[PDB]
Design a protein around this ligand. Structure first.
Ligand code: HEM
Ligand SMILES: [O-][O-]
Length: 153
């Protein structure tokens, strides 16, 4: 798990995100879709986005980025005590959305990239270590639910 000090770093970084949730959320999804175009195919409602300019111009993409980062923020504020919040997310992403755990790795990497990109020189080595640990915990607990369900892809 994470130490008290590590959770404090995580939630400090998260304050940066909360100042512009939609902007951060938009940039995370664009990083995901452009780096890994197969992920776009999981979203019927974003498949029409053929260029990054179209992605940037999509107000619905920003809306979805808000939904995604709001959910993640709720989970992070539980400091690992997130069974009730995480279980339904794991089950919807396995059973309904069919999202392999690989894609959660991709979006975790995207969050780290966007933090550096939006906050260059203000996302320190300790903060990166703590945020990475929190995202691995999130991913690892989803993975346990995926194994229960026998889900791979
Ligand atoms: C930080 C990780 C993620 C979080 C917190 C998250 C959260 C959410 C939430 C709250 C919803 C709406 C409620 C629901 O259907 O459960 C949702 C929907 C969805 N998610 Fe995620 N998600 C994450 C990662 C991903 C990834 C990596 C993909 C695909 C690569 C994905 C694909 C989808 C799709 C296809 C929907 C339905 C979209 C729609 O048509 O409205 N999610 N997600
Ligand atoms: O994408 O959630």
């Amino acid at each position: 798990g994470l130490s008290d000090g590590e959770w404090q770093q995580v939630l400090n970084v998260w304050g940066k995100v909360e100042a512009d949730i939609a902007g951060h959320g938009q940039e995370v999804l664009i990083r995901l879709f452009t780096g890994h175009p197969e992920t776009l195919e999981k979203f019927d409602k974003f498949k029409h986005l053929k260029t990054e300019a179209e992605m940037k111009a999509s107000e619905d993409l920003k809306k979805h980025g808000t939904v995604v980062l709001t959910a993640l923020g709720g989970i992070l504020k539980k400091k690992g005590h997130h069974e009730a919040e995480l279980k339904p997310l794991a089950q919807s992403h396995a059973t309904k959305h069919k999202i392999p755990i690989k894609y959660l790795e991709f979006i975790s990497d995207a969050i780290i990239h966007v933090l550096h990109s939006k906050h260059p020189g203000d996302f320190g080595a300790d903060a990166q270590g703590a945020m990475t640990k929190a995202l691995e915990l999130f991913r690892n607990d989803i993975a346990a639910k995926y194994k229960e369900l026998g889900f791979q892809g």
